[PDB]
mmCIF file of N, CA and C and ligand atoms in Angstrom:
data_model
loop_
_atom_site.group_PDB
_atom_site.id
_atom_site.type_symbol
_atom_site.label_atom_id
_atom_site.label_comp_id
_atom_site.label_asym_id
_atom_site.label_seq_id
_atom_site.Cartn_x
_atom_site.Cartn_y
_atom_site.Cartn_z
ATOM 1 N N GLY A 1 -120.335 -3.567 29.098
ATOM 2 C CA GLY A 1 -119.415 -3.415 30.287
ATOM 3 C C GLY A 1 -119.471 -4.841 31.249
ATOM 4 N N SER A 2 -119.477 -5.760 30.520
ATOM 5 C CA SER A 2 -119.549 -7.224 31.248
ATOM 6 C C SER A 2 -118.390 -8.036 30.635
ATOM 7 N N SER A 3 -117.615 -7.492 29.610
ATOM 8 C CA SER A 3 -116.345 -8.110 29.129
ATOM 9 C C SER A 3 -115.157 -7.468 29.561
ATOM 10 N N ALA A 4 -114.121 -8.090 29.818
ATOM 11 C CA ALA A 4 -112.826 -7.482 30.075
ATOM 12 C C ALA A 4 -112.238 -6.734 29.037
ATOM 13 N N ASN A 5 -112.830 -5.667 28.633
ATOM 14 C CA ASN A 5 -112.320 -4.811 27.655
ATOM 15 C C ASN A 5 -113.160 -3.532 27.773
ATOM 16 N N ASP A 6 -114.238 -3.480 27.233
ATOM 17 C CA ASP A 6 -115.154 -2.385 27.481
ATOM 18 C C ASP A 6 -115.690 -2.332 28.721
ATOM 19 N N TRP A 7 -115.580 -1.232 29.555
ATOM 20 C CA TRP A 7 -115.983 -1.059 30.730
ATOM 21 C C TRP A 7 -117.159 0.014 30.892
ATOM 22 N N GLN A 8 -117.870 -0.008 31.953
ATOM 23 C CA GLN A 8 -119.032 1.097 32.095
ATOM 24 C C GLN A 8 -118.747 1.622 33.513
ATOM 25 N N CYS A 9 -119.050 2.936 33.434
ATOM 26 C CA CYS A 9 -118.936 3.741 34.760
ATOM 27 C C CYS A 9 -119.949 3.350 35.826
ATOM 28 N N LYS A 10 -119.463 3.444 36.935
ATOM 29 C CA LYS A 10 -120.272 3.166 38.095
ATOM 30 C C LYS A 10 -121.209 4.194 38.506
ATOM 31 N N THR A 11 -120.755 5.519 38.115
ATOM 32 C CA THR A 11 -121.511 6.560 38.582
ATOM 33 C C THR A 11 -122.653 6.819 37.455
ATOM 34 N N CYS A 12 -122.474 7.249 36.281
ATOM 35 C CA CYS A 12 -123.338 7.666 35.138
ATOM 36 C C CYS A 12 -123.948 6.349 34.617
ATOM 37 N N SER A 13 -123.357 5.149 34.733
ATOM 38 C CA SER A 13 -123.675 3.895 34.137
ATOM 39 C C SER A 13 -123.649 4.059 32.537
ATOM 40 N N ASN A 14 -122.677 4.915 32.031
ATOM 41 C CA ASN A 14 -122.542 5.128 30.642
ATOM 42 C C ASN A 14 -121.086 4.505 30.357
ATOM 43 N N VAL A 15 -121.065 3.779 29.314
ATOM 44 C CA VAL A 15 -119.801 3.102 28.946
ATOM 45 C C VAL A 15 -118.927 4.196 28.162
ATOM 46 N N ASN A 16 -117.752 4.411 28.641
ATOM 47 C CA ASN A 16 -116.941 5.494 28.035
ATOM 48 C C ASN A 16 -116.307 4.769 26.724
ATOM 49 N N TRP A 17 -114.863 4.785 26.676
ATOM 50 C CA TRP A 17 -114.268 4.098 25.583
ATOM 51 C C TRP A 17 -114.011 2.467 25.938
ATOM 52 N N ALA A 18 -113.686 1.778 25.110
ATOM 53 C CA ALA A 18 -113.575 0.431 25.288
ATOM 54 C C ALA A 18 -112.204 0.068 25.846
ATOM 55 N N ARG A 19 -111.666 1.058 26.639
ATOM 56 C CA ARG A 19 -110.457 1.079 27.329
ATOM 57 C C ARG A 19 -110.092 2.227 28.014
ATOM 58 N N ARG A 20 -111.056 3.055 28.141
ATOM 59 C CA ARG A 20 -110.749 4.545 28.835
ATOM 60 C C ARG A 20 -110.280 4.266 30.203
ATOM 61 N N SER A 21 -109.439 5.252 30.671
ATOM 62 C CA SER A 21 -108.937 5.238 32.028
ATOM 63 C C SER A 21 -109.741 5.732 33.018
ATOM 64 N N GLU A 22 -110.771 6.667 32.608
ATOM 65 C CA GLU A 22 -111.711 7.247 33.472
ATOM 66 C C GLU A 22 -112.766 7.829 32.874
ATOM 67 N N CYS A 23 -113.871 8.049 33.644
ATOM 68 C CA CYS A 23 -115.078 8.603 32.948
ATOM 69 C C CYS A 23 -114.889 10.130 32.645
ATOM 70 N N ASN A 24 -115.380 10.543 31.463
ATOM 71 C CA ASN A 24 -115.204 12.009 31.052
ATOM 72 C C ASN A 24 -116.521 12.754 31.588
ATOM 73 N N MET A 25 -117.466 12.035 32.080
ATOM 74 C CA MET A 25 -118.714 12.756 32.677
ATOM 75 C C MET A 25 -118.603 12.745 34.283
ATOM 76 N N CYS A 26 -118.149 11.719 34.991
ATOM 77 C CA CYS A 26 -118.046 11.766 36.410
ATOM 78 C C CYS A 26 -116.662 11.793 36.810
ATOM 79 N N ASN A 27 -115.645 11.694 35.916
ATOM 80 C CA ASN A 27 -114.300 11.707 36.162
ATOM 81 C C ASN A 27 -113.850 10.450 37.197
ATOM 82 N N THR A 28 -114.751 9.444 37.021
ATOM 83 C CA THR A 28 -114.404 8.291 37.855
ATOM 84 C C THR A 28 -113.327 7.490 37.234
ATOM 85 N N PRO A 29 -112.286 7.149 38.023
ATOM 86 C CA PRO A 29 -111.266 6.151 37.610
ATOM 87 C C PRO A 29 -111.935 4.842 37.129
ATOM 88 N N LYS A 30 -111.390 4.168 36.118
ATOM 89 C CA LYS A 30 -111.805 2.945 35.655
ATOM 90 C C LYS A 30 -112.301 2.022 36.699
ATOM 91 N N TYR A 31 -111.598 1.644 37.648
ATOM 92 C CA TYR A 31 -112.017 0.702 38.726
ATOM 93 C C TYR A 31 -111.347 1.247 40.066
ATOM 94 N N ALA A 32 -112.087 2.232 40.616
ATOM 95 C CA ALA A 32 -111.714 2.759 41.855
ATOM 96 C C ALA A 32 -112.177 2.094 43.003
ATOM 97 N N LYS A 33 -112.460 0.823 42.992
ATOM 98 C CA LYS A 33 -112.944 0.035 44.014
ATOM 99 C C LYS A 33 -112.196 -1.437 43.983
HETATM 100 ZN ZN1 ZN B 1 -119.572 8.426 34.580
#
């Protein structure tokens, strides 16, 4: 989650898919900030 491809949730700190739109655990949008 430091490369512009695979991202990491800001809530659970778990990396979803290498291009997911949102978290499946927290339902956090990719980058809602
Ligand atoms: Zn999450």
